[PDB]
């Protein structure tokens, strides 16, 4: 019998590492179905904000206009998605954009040659002014009521150092990109995670004792922190299983072709969530759980 | 022609890394693997993206239709 | 010894500053040498 209590008694979380960008925790005694559901919801259905509808006034740059629009829409934005709501479809496109769900990112740049251009200067950082357009140049501007709401939030790209376009003197860019809420399953630019994946904990079943120099090489097959030599009795024991990446270098040697089995525990996942800069991986996982729960709840309460 | 904002396979941003990679490679005798390690790229999906970018926009820019040559 | 190498620094250098001396990639020109040499042999070389 499986019950909610019989699952709560055995399930556990071991947050091995944490950071504002990358988490690495463990889900134990949970089903591969639910762990995979969390992973997929996390990588696709967790909302985020990225520019969608660009507006271009001039683009004399070498970069094609649509290529620049794609690059601009790609860049992550250090915006909490919960600060702005969702956009409409049936509403007129002149009126679908409110001050509660849209972020405007102007970018006005004009490359001009540096009059004090040194002789023998090859690096363009001296020969031209504003030759390189960086994502820092995307300058958020408040609209309507945004002044008294997003004041403390310095809306900037989650990376201000991503390169947008390389210019030449005379060439100009002048655009305004509207940002809205979206999800990863729609377009890969809304995915709030650089990655989100797990792996079952490797299992190393040593059947016959490995003693002497044989255990010394048997340890060298695995990563350095996986197998250890016992102090007193010269042997091999599994020191840290998580540290092992399953490469099966042992199986290439016949002396270990019958002394070890490389199994794998089927209920012990090792998640690793890297935020794209928009949020933090602990909150990404929290919202993945909340999305799965709200999805099951909406299915439950939806009339049949 | 110009460095992509996000790595195709995963999504790890490699577009804020091209100048850093070039600087690491030219200022010191850093090999490409070491530079890609120090730049935050440990999976080969990210590593090849900056190991194998051509940056053809340099050759592209040298034909300016708005400058005397 | 490494068998090959991404000459990324050289590639960026040749993108930024094309050589003013004899062009790089010498073997890319012996490839076309047939057509150019054929045309140049009718209005140059011995006997006019």
């Amino acid at each position: 019998e499986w019950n909610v209590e019989k699952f709560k008694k055995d399930f556990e979380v071991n947050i091995s590492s944490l950071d504002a960008r990358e988490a690495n925790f463990d889900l134990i005694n949970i089903d591969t179905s639910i762990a995979n559901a969390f992973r997929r919801i996390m990588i696709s259905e967790v909302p985020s904000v990225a520019a969608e509808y660009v507006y271009f006034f001039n683009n004399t740059s070498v970069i094609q206009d649509e290529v620049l629009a794609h690059r601009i829409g790609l860049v992550p934005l250090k915006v909490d998605p919960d600060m702005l709501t969702w956009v409409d479809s049936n509403l007129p496109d002149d009126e679908k954009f409110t001050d509660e769900n849209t972020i405007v990112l102007s970018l006005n740049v004009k490359c001009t040659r540096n009059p004090d251009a040194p002789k023998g200067s090859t690096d363009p950082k001296e020969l031209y002014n504003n030759a390189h357009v960086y994502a820092r140049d995307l300058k958020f501007e408040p609209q309507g009521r945004q002044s008294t709401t997003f004041a403390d939030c310095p809306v900037v790209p989650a990376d201000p150092d991503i390169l947008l376009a390389k210019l030449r003197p005379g060439q100009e860019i002048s655009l305004k990109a509207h940002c809205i809420l979206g999800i990863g399953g729609d377009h890969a630019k809304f995915s709030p995670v650089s990655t989100a994946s797990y792996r079952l904990l490797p299992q190393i079943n040593i059947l016959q004792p490995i003693k002497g120099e044989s255990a010394r090489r048997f340890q060298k097959c695995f990563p350095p922190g996986v197998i250890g030599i016992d102090e007193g009795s010269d042997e091999a024991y599994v020191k840290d299983a998580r540290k092992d990446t399953v490469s099966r270098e042992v199986l290439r040697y016949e002396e270990f072709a019958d002394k070890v089995k490389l199994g794998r525990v089927r209920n012990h996942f090792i998640f690793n969530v890297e935020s794209a800069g928009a949020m933090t991986p602990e909150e990404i996982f929290f919202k993945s759980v909340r999305i799965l729960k709200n999805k099951a709840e909406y299915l439950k309460n939806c009339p049949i | 022609m110009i460095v992509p904002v996000r790595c195709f396979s995963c999504g790890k941003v490699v577009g804020d890394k091209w100048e850093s990679y070039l600087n690491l490679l030219q200022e010191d005798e850093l090999d490409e693997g070491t530079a890609l390690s120090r730049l935050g790229l440990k999976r080969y999906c990210c590593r090849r993206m900056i190991l194998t970018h051509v940056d053809l926009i340099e050759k592209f820019l040298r034909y300016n239709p708005l400058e005397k040559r | 010894a490494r068998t090959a190498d991404f000459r990324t620094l050289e590639r960026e250098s040749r993108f930024i500053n094309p050589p003013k001396d004899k062009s790089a990639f010498p073997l890319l020109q012996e490839a076309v040498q047939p057509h150019i040499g054929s045309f140049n042999a009718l209005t140059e070389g011995p006997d006019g």
């Binding site: 091995s16 590492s17 690495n24 994946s197 792996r199 990563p223 998580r242 540290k243 092992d244 990446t245 090792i270 690793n272 | 693997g33 440990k42 | 010894a1 490494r2 068998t3």
Partner: peptide
């Protein structure tokens, strides 16, 4: 014929997640 030259000084690149 000498064999293909070996790229020497090679270290361990793949470390498990969290490592």
């Amino acid at each position: 014929r000498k064999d293909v030259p070996k790229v020497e000084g090679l270290k361990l690149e793949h470390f498990a997640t969290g490592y």
